[PDB]
């Protein structure tokens, strides 16, 4: 039909590519903590509830670090849309792993496979969507702002349909379901891909020469030798348990930035120097951001009277309030703060989240159930951080791809402090920690 929203018509194919990517991965992300749960409760996965909330945290962690090399391996080795293409397969794959009648055994092959397929395809749908636009066009902000609607809305009717899918039919069928929704990605990216996109991209566009290909090779082997160095001395001074894994993938997501920091500090350096509390600031907001699939999952499960819905359904708070707020921010921006200072005022407000969810157990106790509205506040105060510091965030700077991955690392350590009885301090205390490193950012806002 012509343009697509004003857009080159190859935007629809992108834009639903994308859309049923993220049906697959936020479907599974809002019943796969209870599927553990699940599976813990039977007695087929042994591991804690603590354990399998660490694991959501660094299941997203290794998402966003395998993001950061997809981009690299589709100019350099593969093709752009072959990267996206072959993406989708995996995802898919690991989604019909679920589906199948197993149980934990099942579980890691699902994670790894949508680990590596999404580090494949979500970096470079992203650099399909820039190449609709040849160049210097004013149309490319509209553009991506229409494919990240798609990703948000994705994400929003994920959580209601295989949730209710949970509810309906098994846990196996609500993973089956995900797993056709990126069928249906993968259907209309390659015919819709083959009608409109460039055969450019099919292919490399900064192919390895010759001489790059032996130091690649060296550089991914020493890096694995390494790694499986590291995991046999693990195991053979006993560390060898699930949570001592995770505690290993922390590190290595933790170093990763570091390493890289502590290599730019080695020409008015300061600029990095200026850097480090606007990454510090950027890992501790998408912590608390990306704790409401752990955490304020855990809470609307055991905490929420939500009999009448099913409980995933509150994960389709977080799109939803993105779909809400973003027209606003978006006149409300061309009518204004600096970058910094915009990244204390999202802290302060993801910080205000977890302030407001430690009221309810302070006055009504903990061993009760509380309104749903409870968690419906808090996602709306996470979101409305999610507003200044994402859109300017990218400016400001990927290494701030890596930022999300940092956080769910961190992550990945402090929700396994979450139960019950800790509750009240868990979320006060932390909440209270952001609020304050807000107010030292503010403080800091001058320097920058
Ligand atoms: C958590 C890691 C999962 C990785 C799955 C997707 C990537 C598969 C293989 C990675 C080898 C490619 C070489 C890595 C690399 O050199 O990246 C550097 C590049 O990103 C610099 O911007
Ligand atoms: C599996 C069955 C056939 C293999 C299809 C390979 C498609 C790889 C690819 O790059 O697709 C990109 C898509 O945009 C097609 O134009
Ligand atoms: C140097 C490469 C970094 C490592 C990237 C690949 C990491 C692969 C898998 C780790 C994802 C989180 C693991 C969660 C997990 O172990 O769950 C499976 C466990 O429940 C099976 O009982
Ligand atoms: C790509 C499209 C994926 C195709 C997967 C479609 C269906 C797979 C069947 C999964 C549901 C069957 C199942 O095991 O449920 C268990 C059931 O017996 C519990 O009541
Ligand atoms: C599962 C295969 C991926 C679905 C798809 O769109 O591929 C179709 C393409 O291979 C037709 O030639
Ligand atoms: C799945 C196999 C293990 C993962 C492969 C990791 C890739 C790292 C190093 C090898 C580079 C492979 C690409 C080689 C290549 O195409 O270079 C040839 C060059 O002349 C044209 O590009
Ligand atoms: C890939 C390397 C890190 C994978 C960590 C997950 C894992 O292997 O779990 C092992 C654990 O289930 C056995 O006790
Ligand atoms: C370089 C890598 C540095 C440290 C890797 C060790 C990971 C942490 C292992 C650990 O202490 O887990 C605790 C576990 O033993 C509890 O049973
Ligand atoms: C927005 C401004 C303030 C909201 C603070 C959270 C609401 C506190 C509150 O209403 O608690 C009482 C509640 O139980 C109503 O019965
Ligand atoms: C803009 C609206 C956001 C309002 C949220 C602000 C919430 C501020 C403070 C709530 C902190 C509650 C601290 C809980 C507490 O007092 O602990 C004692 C409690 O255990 C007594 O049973
Ligand atoms: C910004 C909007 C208003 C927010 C006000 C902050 C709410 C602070 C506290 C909520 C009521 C918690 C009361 C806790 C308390 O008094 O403990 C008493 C009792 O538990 C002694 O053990
Ligand atoms: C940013 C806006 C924050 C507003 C969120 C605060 C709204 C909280 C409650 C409003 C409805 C009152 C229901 C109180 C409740 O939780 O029920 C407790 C009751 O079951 C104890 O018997
Ligand atoms: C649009 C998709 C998001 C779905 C979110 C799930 C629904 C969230 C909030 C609706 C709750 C309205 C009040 C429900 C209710 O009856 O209150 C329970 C009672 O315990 C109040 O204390
Ligand atoms: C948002 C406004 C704060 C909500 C609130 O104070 O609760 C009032 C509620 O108890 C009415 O019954
Ligand atoms: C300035 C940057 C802030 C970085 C994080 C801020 C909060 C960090 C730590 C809070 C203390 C909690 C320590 C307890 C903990 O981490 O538990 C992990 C342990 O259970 C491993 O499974
Ligand atoms: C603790 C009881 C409530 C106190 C809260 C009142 C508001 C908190 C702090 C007020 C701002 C402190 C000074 C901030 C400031 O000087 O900013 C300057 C900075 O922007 C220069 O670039």
Same mark, same amino acid.
């Given at each position: 039909?012509?343009?697509?929203?004003?857009?080159?018509?190859?935007?629809?194919?992108?834009?639903?590519?994308?859309?049923? =990517?993220?049906?697959?991965?936020?479907?599974?992300?809002? $019943?796969?903590?209870?599927?553990?749960?699940?599976?813990?409760?039977?007695?087929?996965?042994? $591991?804690?509830? /603590?354990?399998?909330?660490?694991?959501?945290?660094?299941?997203?962690?290794?998402?966003?670090?395998?993001?950061?090399?997809?981009?690299?391996?589709?100019?350099?080795?593969?093709?752009?849309?072959?990267?996206?293409?072959?993406?989708?397969?995996?995802?898919?794959?690991?989604?019909?792993?679920?589906?199948?009648?197993? @149980?934990?055994?099942?579980?890691?092959?699902?994670?790894?496979?949508?680990?590596?397929?999404? @580090?494949?395809?979500?970096? #470079?749908?992203?650099?399909?969507?820039?190449?609709?636009?040849?160049?210097?066009?004013?149309?490319?902000?509209? @553009?991506?702002?229409?494919?990240?609607?798609?990703?948000?809305?994705?994400?929003? $009717? *994920?959580?209601?349909?295989? @949730?209710?899918?949970? =509810?309906?039919?098994?846990?196996?069928?609500?993973?089956?379901? /995900?797993?056709?929704?990126?069928?249906?990605?993968?259907?209309?990216?390659?015919?819709?891909?083959?009608?409109?996109?460039?055969?450019?991209?099919?292919?490399?566009?900064?192919?390895?020469?010759?001489?790059?290909?032996?130091?690649?090779?060296?550089?991914?082997?020493?890096?694995?030798?390494?790694?499986?160095?590291?995991?046999?001395?693990? %195991?053979?001074?006993?560390? %060898?348990?699930?949570?001592?894994?995770? %505690?290993?993938?922390?590190?290595?997501?933790?170093?990763?930035?570091?390493?890289?920091?502590?290599?730019?500090?080695?020409?008015?350096?300061?600029?990095?120097?200026?850097?480090?509390?606007?990454?510090?600031?950027?890992?501790?907001?998408? /912590?608390?951001? =990306?704790?409401?699939?752990?955490?304020?999952?855990?809470?609307?499960?055991?905490?929420?009277?939500?009999?009448?819905?099913?409980?995933?359904?509150?994960?389709?708070? #977080?799109?939803?309030?993105?779909?809400?707020?973003?027209?606003?921010? *978006?006149?409300?921006?061309? *009518?204004?703060?600096?970058?910094?200072?915009?990244?204390?005022?999202?802290?302060?407000?993801?910080?205000?989240?977890?302030?407001?969810?430690?009221?309810?157990?302070?006055?009504?106790?903990?061993?009760?159930?509380?309104?749903?509205?409870?968690?419906?506040?808090?996602?709306?105060?996470?979101?409305?951080? =999610?507003?200044?510091?994402?859109?300017?965030?990218?400016?400001?700077?990927?290494?701030?791809?890596?930022?999300?991955?940092?956080?769910?690392?961190? #992550?990945?350590?402090?929700?396994?402090?979450? %139960?019950?009885?800790?509750?009240?301090?868990?979320?006060?205390?932390?909440?209270?920690?952001?609020?304050?490193?807000?107010?030292?950012?503010?403080?800091?806002?001058?320097?920058?």
């Amino acid at each position: 039909g012509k343009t697509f929203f004003g857009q080159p018509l190859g935007l629809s194919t992108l834009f639903m590519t994308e859309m049923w =990517e993220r049906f697959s991965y936020y479907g599974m992300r809002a $019943i796969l903590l209870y599927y553990m749960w699940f599976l813990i409760s039977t007695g087929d996965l042994h $591991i804690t509830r /603590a354990t399998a909330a660490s694991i959501m945290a660094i299941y997203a962690s290794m998402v966003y670090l395998s993001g950061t090399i997809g981009g690299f391996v589709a100019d350099r080795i593969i093709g752009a849309r072959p990267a996206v293409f072959w993406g989708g397969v995996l995802i898919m794959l690991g989604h019909i792993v679920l589906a199948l009648p197993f @149980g934990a055994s099942a579980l890691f092959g699902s994670i790894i496979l949508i680990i590596i397929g999404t @580090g494949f395809l979500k970096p #470079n749908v992203s650099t399909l969507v820039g190449t609709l636009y040849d160049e210097h066009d004013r149309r490319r902000d509209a @553009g991506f702002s229409i494919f990240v609607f798609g990703i948000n809305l994705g994400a929003f $009717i *994920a959580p209601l349909i295989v @949730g209710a899918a949970q =509810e309906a039919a098994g846990y196996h069928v609500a993973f089956s379901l /995900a797993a056709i929704g990126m069928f249906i990605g993968l259907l209309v990216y390659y015919f819709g891909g083959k009608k409109t996109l460039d055969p450019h991209y099919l292919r490399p566009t900064d192919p390895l020469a010759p001489e790059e290909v032996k130091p690649l090779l060296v550089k991914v082997s020493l890096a694995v030798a390494g790694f499986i160095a590291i995991i046999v001395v693990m %195991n053979l001074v006993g560390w %060898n348990s699930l949570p001592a894994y995770i %505690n290993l993938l922390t590190i290595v997501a933790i170093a990763i930035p570091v390493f890289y920091f502590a290599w730019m500090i080695s020409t008015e350096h300061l600029r990095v120097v200026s850097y480090i509390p606007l990454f510090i600031a950027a890992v501790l907001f998408w /912590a608390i951001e =990306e704790q409401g699939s752990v955490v304020l999952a855990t809470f609307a499960a055991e905490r929420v009277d939500s009999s009448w819905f099913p409980v995933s359904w509150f994960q389709s708070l #977080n799109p939803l309030f993105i779909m809400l707020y973003t027209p606003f921010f *978006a006149w409300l921006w061309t *009518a204004q703060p600096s970058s910094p200072t915009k990244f204390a005022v999202g802290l302060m407000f993801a910080g205000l989240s977890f302030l407001l969810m430690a009221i309810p157990g302070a006055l009504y106790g903990t061993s009760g159930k509380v309104s749903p509205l409870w968690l419906v506040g808090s996602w709306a105060l996470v979101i409305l951080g =999610e507003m200044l510091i994402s859109p300017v965030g990218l400016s400001v700077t990927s290494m701030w791809f890596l930022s999300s991955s940092v956080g769910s690392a961190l #992550n990945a350590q402090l929700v396994t402090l979450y %139960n019950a009885k800790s509750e009240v301090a868990y979320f006060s205390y932390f909440g209270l920690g952001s609020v304050v490193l807000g107010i030292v950012l503010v403080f800091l806002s001058k320097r920058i």
